[PDB]
Structure 1
């Protein structure tokens, strides 16, 4: 049960892929590697069951950049059978570190869970 527990949550900007833009999103990282985003913080169970974005951070790559926006981090991960890169930015390097440290820790936990 605590496998589906929330490890970290908060606001961040998700980068456009083919369009230059930053979309505001509220993301929750769960202990089973699920990383889900919403346009606003989910108020209830129903709002939680309808995420706009949903990635798995198992075995991901975590990169940190300052261009074009400072405090940006990139995640290279597997969406089913396709490797994808998603880009996010937060307000401070302190929060970026909280996010990349939380993500890596979860990935390491899933691996060690192959126990």
Structure 2
């Protein structure tokens, strides 16, 4: 129960709009249960933590590193209920991008092992 809701990684990033393709600052949190949740403002209490702006599930996701429109961009391709979606993120260094993509992959891998077991 409690290990599943551990926060694996959290931090600020920029998230690109889907239609108005600007880079928007968002605070994201990844948990062991595959939830990847974003906030406009970094939450400062539990009520704020419980009301994210963005909410994705990283189970079986694909993780793509790209250099356009900016270096150090990454794309997650994931399933949102029954629709495949892509979301685009940016951080300031390739090392930080690797930290995020590896963290997400590690969580996805743990979920697949749970399924197998």
TM-score (norm 1): 0.98
| Residues 1:89 and 2:90 are matched in the alignment | yes
- SS, match of residue 48 in structure 2: helix
- SS, match of residue 100 in structure 2: helix
Unaligned runs of 5+ in 2: none
**Alignment: residue pair count:** 115
Paired with 1:44 and 1:8, the residues of 2 have a C-alpha distance of 18
Q: CA deviation at 1:49?
A: 0.8
Where does structure 1 differ by over 6 angstroms across 4 or more consecutive aligned residues? none
- SS, match of residue 19 in structure 1: coil
Root mean square deviation of aligned Cα? 0.6
Q: CA deviation at 1:88?
A: 0.2
- SS, match of residue 106 in structure 2: helix
Unaligned runs of 5+ in 1: none
TM-score (norm 2): 0.96
